[PDB]
A = this chain, B = another copy of it.
Amino acid sequence: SGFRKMAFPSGKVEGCMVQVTCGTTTLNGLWLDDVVYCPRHVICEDMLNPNYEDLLIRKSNHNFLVQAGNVQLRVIGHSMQNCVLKLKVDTANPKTPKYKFVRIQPGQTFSVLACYNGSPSGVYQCAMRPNFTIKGSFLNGSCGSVGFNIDYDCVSFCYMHHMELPTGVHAGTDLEGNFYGPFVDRQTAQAAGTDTTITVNVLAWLYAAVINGDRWFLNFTTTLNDFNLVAMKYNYEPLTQDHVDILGPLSAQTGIAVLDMCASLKELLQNGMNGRTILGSALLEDEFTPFDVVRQCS
């Protein structure tokens, strides 16, 4: 019983964080096999309008200092892929877990291991927003921290932190260096664009609430089309038959039809929560996927 924002155990990722220093810039890197991955702005004052190609040409292998705890790595190769720097080192990380690199979809969640100077300081869960930002918790020095999921023994790396926008939300790349969203690694104004609420995740959280005994919001039914009208009015993502199918296991376990749950959600959107709480929250929570609910309620 109980429902919490739960991160994955971070041990397997803790073993791969290192510090990367270039000139006087220092940030975090990810050491997997014999490759270290970090944001290419480690090579930047220059960040206002950088020519990354030109700046990397002034660099040689020995200009990159890589420290794994108290262990110094020997950099024997370096290349740029999209917005990540890849540093070939002479040693394979003995702590390399089984892993993959994944580009997650908006709405999916992942655990963030926040790191400074190559040392982990905290773990927390968050979601890729529909507008490809994340609402993280990061201070200067946190660049190169990574987000991940764990399936059995395999770590799926999906996020490397690059930037805090002036609005205070965060932007980064997948581990091949492609930004999520329209962002570029330059210190210049950048619009994120309208965000929306992750509808399928809010429904999954209503199912979690029912599983936990919070039932007051159950009431009617609706149509996929009728609901999507109300979704649009309150800046919720449109619900698709694909989303309905993903909620099937929770619908089967609770006995509540998905469109019945949509009808509950519609009444909460149209009438507010009335000072009451659901799973300890006075707002509709959208950062639990259907998988997160099943994991934590299974």
Chain A interface (Cβ < 8 Å from any Cβ of B)? 1-12, 14-15, 113-114, 120-124, 126, 135-139, 164, 168-170, 212-213, 277, 280-283, 295-298
Contact = CB atoms under 8 A, between A and B. Distances in A.
Nearest to A164: B1
B10 A11 contact: yes
**Residue with the greatest number of chain B CB neighbours at <10 A, chosen from A11, A135, A212, A277:** A11
A259 to B, nearest CB: 27
Given A4-B124, A10-B123, A123-B123, 8 more contacts: A2-B168, A4-B136, A5-B5, A7-B7, A7-B123, A9-B14, A9-B122, A277-B283
A178 B135 CA distance: 40
Interface of A is mostly: loop
A213 B168 contact: yes
A12 B9 CA distance: 10
Contacts of A122: 6-9, 295-296
Contacts of A280: 135
Given A15-B11, A138-B1, A164-B1, A6 B123 contact: yes
Nearest to A115: B9
**Residue with the greatest number of chain B CB neighbours at <10 A, chosen from A9, A281, A282:** A9
A135 B7 contact: no
Contacts of A7: 7, 122-124
Contact of A282 (B113, B169, B282): B282
Given A7-B123, A123-B10, A2 B138 contact: yes
Contact of A137 (B4, B14, B137, B281): B4
